[PDB]
Amino acid sequence: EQTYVISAPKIFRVGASENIVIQVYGYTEAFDATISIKSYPDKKFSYSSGHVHLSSENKFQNSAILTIQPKQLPGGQNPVSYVYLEVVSKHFSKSKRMPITYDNGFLFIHTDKPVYTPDQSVKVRVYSLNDDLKPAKRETVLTFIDPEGSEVDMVEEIDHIGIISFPDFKIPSNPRYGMWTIKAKYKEDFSTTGTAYFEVKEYVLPHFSVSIEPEYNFIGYKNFKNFE
Amino acid sequence: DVNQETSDLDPSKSVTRVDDGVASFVLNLPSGVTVLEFNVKTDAPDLPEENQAREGYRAIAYSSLSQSYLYIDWTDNHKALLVGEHLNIIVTPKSPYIDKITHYNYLILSKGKIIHFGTREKFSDASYQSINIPVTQNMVPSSRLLVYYIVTGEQTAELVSDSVWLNIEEKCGNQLQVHLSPDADAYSPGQTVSLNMATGMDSWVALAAVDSAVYGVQRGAKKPLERVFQFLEKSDLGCGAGGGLNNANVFHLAGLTFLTNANADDSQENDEPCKLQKKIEEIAAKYKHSVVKKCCYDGACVNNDETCEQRAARISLGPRCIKAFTECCVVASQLRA
Numbered sequence: 001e002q003t004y005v006i007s008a009p010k011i012f013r014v015g016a017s018e019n020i021v022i023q024v025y026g027y028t029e030a031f032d033a034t035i036s037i038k039s040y041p042d043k044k045f046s047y048s049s050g051h052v053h054l055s056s057e058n059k060f061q062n063s064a065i066l067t068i069q070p071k072q073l074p075g076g077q078n079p080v081s082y083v084y085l086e087v088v089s090k091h092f093s094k095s096k097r098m099p100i101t102y103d104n105g106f107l108f109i110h111t112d113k114p115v116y117t118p119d120q121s122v123k124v125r126v127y128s129l130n131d132d133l134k135p136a137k138r139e140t141v142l143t144f145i146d147p148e149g150s151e152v153d154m155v156e157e158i159d160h161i162g163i164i165s166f167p168d169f170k171i172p173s174n175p176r177y178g179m180w181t182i183k184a185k186y187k188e189d190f191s192t193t194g195t196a197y198f199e200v201k202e203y204v205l206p207h208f209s210v211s212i213e214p215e216y217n218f219i220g221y222k223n224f225k226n227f228e
Numbered sequence: 229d230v231n232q233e234t235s236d237l238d239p240s241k242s243v244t245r246v247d248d249g250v251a252s253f254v255l256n257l258p259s260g261v262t263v264l265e266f267n268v269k270t271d272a273p274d275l276p277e278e279n280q281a282r283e284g285y286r287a288i289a290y291s292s293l294s295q296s297y298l299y300i301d302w303t304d305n306h307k308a309l310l311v312g313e314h315l316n317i318i319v320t321p322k323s324p325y326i327d328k329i330t331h332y333n334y335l336i337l338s339k340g341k342i343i344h345f346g347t348r349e350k351f352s353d354a355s356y357q358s359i360n361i362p363v364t365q366n367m368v369p370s371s372r373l374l375v376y377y378i379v380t381g382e383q384t385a386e387l388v389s390d391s392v393w394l395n396i397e398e399k400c401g402n403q404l405q406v407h408l409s410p411d412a413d414a415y416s417p418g419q420t421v422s423l424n425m426a427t428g429m430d431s432w433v434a435l436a437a438v439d440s441a442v443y444g445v446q447r448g449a450k451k452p453l454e455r456v457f458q459f460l461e462k463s464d465l466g467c468g469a470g471g472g473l474n475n476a477n478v479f480h481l482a483g484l485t486f487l488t489n490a491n492a493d494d495s496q497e498n499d500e501p502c503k504l505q506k507k508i509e510e511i512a513a514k515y516k517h518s519v520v521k522k523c524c525y526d527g528a529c530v531n532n533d534e535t536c537e538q539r540a541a542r543i544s545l546g547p548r549c550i551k552a553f554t555e556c557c558v559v560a561s562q563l564r565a
Contacts, residue, residue, distance in 0.1 A: 001380045006487035019342040094487045110452045113442045221279045
């Protein structure tokens with residue numbers, strides 16, 4: 001009685017370098033195994049494959065890193081929901097259906113301050129990463145949205161490093177105050193979505209400043225009867 | 229029970245340690261235990277029974293056809309997991325009846341990808357067996373470990389697996405640091421300050437000078453610095469503290485899918501998340517018209533230099549606000565005498 005084990009992540013990320021592990025037990029001498037990925041309905045399109053040779057030298061365990069190239073997907077804007085993973089060897093063969101997603105890296109939107117006043121400037125930069133938490137230089141497009149919800153200005157910048165410094169945003173003389181939204185996405189094929197917020201309020205000169213200090217930041221059973 | 233029989237265990241009591249902040253418990257359950265429900269509460273001396281904290285929980289048994297189960301644990305107290313050290317992991321495979329095993333198989337994952345794999349040889353004599361696992365830099369944010377062995381039944385082959393979640397120290401690649409040459413806490417206006425940046429490797433740095441009062445209230449002041457860790461940890465596909473209902477469920481809680489003979493995983497149905505004036509307030513609040521209530525407010529504002537209707541002539545909004553405005557001005561003029 002002899003058996004094989006194929007280990008893969010639950011979902012696949014496009015453009016990610018994904019590690020597939022093959023571990024085989026109960027076999028003598030050595031053999032080669034091929035692990036590839038195809039399209040769900042038919043296996044014609046093969047987005048990548050790998051070849052691993054397992055022996056007593058290798059303890060009958062091998063690893064292969066598959067990658068889904070983003071540009072081999074359908075040019076139409078309708079996504080591909082499922083993808084086949086195929087393992088073929090001399091002694092056996094097996095196939096599996098597994099979903100994918102276009103969420104890949106991470107977009108973190110760094111602003112200098114959470115609050116702004118009229119006629120100020122918003123100093124903003126973005127950090128973009130891949131599945132490996134590595135720079136992943138990609139041209140990123142971010143858009144601004146006002147508290148009323150309309151897209152105001154849209155800007156795009158290429159990535160030399162992974163610290164992307166976007167043009168400063170000028171605040172109008174008489175703006176619409178409220179909670180403002182900044183969205184970031186990669187230009188073409190990536191669905192990775194970063195988001196951040198910042199608030200804008202009209203400045204007024206206080207006649208005097210008032211502070212309110214409690215006894216604690218929480219009300220416990222002790223002070224339920226009296227709170228200084 | 230599997231017979232649907234409930235038994236109360238003799239209650240256990242412990243105390244959280246000084247270092248770990250964890251009260252440790254161990255329950256020896258009957259062999260045929262299926263589901264275990266337990267309530268944990270605080271006995272603290274100066275707190276009344278009302279004001280003590282309490283939380284209940286439920287636990288389910290791992291289901292296997294071959295009566296073969298597995299439990300893995302990393303032995304420590306005040307768990308740290310320094311990088312580069314050795315992780316000594318105790319494996320207690322035993323309560324299979326069919327158990328004489330060829331080998332154990334290990335898989336190690338971090339940040340949503342498979343960083344390590346291997347196999348160790350089983351000693352057919354002693355039961356519990358230890359594995360020395362190097363902790364590497366691929367594991368920096370956090371990592372999950374999966375261990376499984378196979379048993380050959382007269383019916384089918386069978387996989388037996390268990391998983392463990394591992395929180396590891398946060399240690400960067402570059403470990404970049406910033407300092408000021410006048411490291412004292414006081415500073416004077418216009419004082420020249422030397423800024424020092426030191427990294428373990430060539431790296432790009434970006435700074436921020438943000439007034440501490442920009443955050444406003446001190447409690448709950450969040451930056452990208454604060455949200456970057458947790459918002460970044462979503463790269464991990466798996467959730468929970470480890471374990472599972474069955475072998476395939478252990479793998480899925482680890483965030484994995486497999487292709488074998490013995491055990492068919494169910495990934496098809498798996499897509500899931502996981503963890504005086506009262507007279508004024510009469511008309512004012514009673515009309516309940518969003519446009520009118522304002523007309524009642526500024527209707528009742530004090531005006532010495534013109535009459536109520538003289539102020540009412542400047543209303544362009546229509547009579548709907550005239551009827552309210554005029555009344556709210558009269559009441560204000562009446563009640564202030």
